[PDB]
Symmetry: D2
Subunit: 124 residues, 4 copies
């Protein structure tokens, strides 16, 4: 099972845990997912969060839907060496989702050296 490589936890003590927050405005659900809300995650050429993915499993349904994927692609690398570009993409992802359904939202994130991480929250 691939799940044996996915870690979870308390984002209060664990900096890798993706934190999911949302604000439902009408038929629009604005979701914010970030890594390092309490404990800041490094963002260097050698160590950084590569991306965050958001999934949505509607209440009572059998198939999860991938809502979106955000890749953080700049990590200081340049022809002058690692951490010299002064260009870094922070692990903060925003998704605007249009739905009137309820269910569960899942976040899947990947650190280039610390593997896969997940979290979830109920979409009321």
């Amino acid at each position: 099972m691939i799940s044996e490589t996915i870690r979870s936890g308390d984002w209060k003590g664990e900096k890798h845990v993706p934190v999911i927050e949302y604000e439902r405005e009408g038929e629009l659900v604005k979701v914010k997912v970030q890594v390092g809300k309490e404990i800041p995650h490094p963002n260097t050429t050698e160590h950084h969060i590569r991306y965050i993915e958001l999934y949505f499993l509607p209440e009572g349904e059998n198939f999860v839907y991938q809502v979106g994927r955000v890749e953080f692609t700049a990590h200081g690398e340049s022809v002058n060496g690692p951490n010299t570009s002064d260009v870094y993409t922070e692990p903060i992802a925003y998704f605007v989702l249009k739905t009137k359904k309820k269910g569960k939202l899942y976040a899947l994130s990947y650190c280039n050296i610390h593997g896969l991480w997940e979290n979830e929250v109920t979409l009321e």
Copy 2:
């Protein structure tokens, strides 16, 4: 050249043109990119914006950096047919960039049936 397949234009009359807006806060540059600001773009199983990419070429430098990529992966598809899931991901992308440099930001977006689209703005 691939540029012969990339279209551009004024987003006040062309719904496909990605619109770039940003807010500088310290060393943090918050960028918002969206397709269909004025003229909303369809988002159906048959026709939808697939993703938006953000690039940054610092002033006076020779190599552009990809800042990030956002894929909008839900477009109504379900086992019950096209446009039946009530789950759609709107073409609105947000990027949090950490840099003190100035330059030019580029947005590249792709429609599943209307090809590639671009736009750019100066990052002051």
Copy 3:
């Protein structure tokens, strides 16, 4: 846990399950992953495999590494309607990995209406 949305099984019954095969040639490991090895998986505008990801957990290590990601982006869509372009990308992904380590390879695939699917094989 996201694992509750991930399905698995024998590829001899479920035309979904991603099938992993590899050939080691020294330091080079060529991996082939595909969905629909037995009974072909549909590839229409309405129903298709979006991508296949390959992961590698070296023997005795604690963090899994994402080896690669292949997105199949053409599914017949065109300005003339769904399934009219005559351009389809088959769900067959190849990965050339350079490593002398052994361990476990995992494949994760996403169907646009049937959720996430996984499979794994030991890399000797």
Copy 4:
């Protein structure tokens, strides 16, 4: 224009240019794209090819289709430091395209400190 950040050239002299080769087997077009054919390209934590994308503009049509995208995500990074994992993903991408149409194929690749690179061949 984003094209001002995209470089092109002779693959026999520039170890960055993506080389496109294909084979037509009836209805299937097997496309191989690689960076570093003539002059292998560094693949270190600090300097590596991030991905290769393949596009297809059918003869006489107005909209280019993205056929696929392959991300090479492992570049030696580990908790031990840069270039210590012994896990690297080579910049070799394979695409299986189902189409009876002819036209032009374009490859777009991104090095992490060298920007965007392109190439194109006629699909007969």
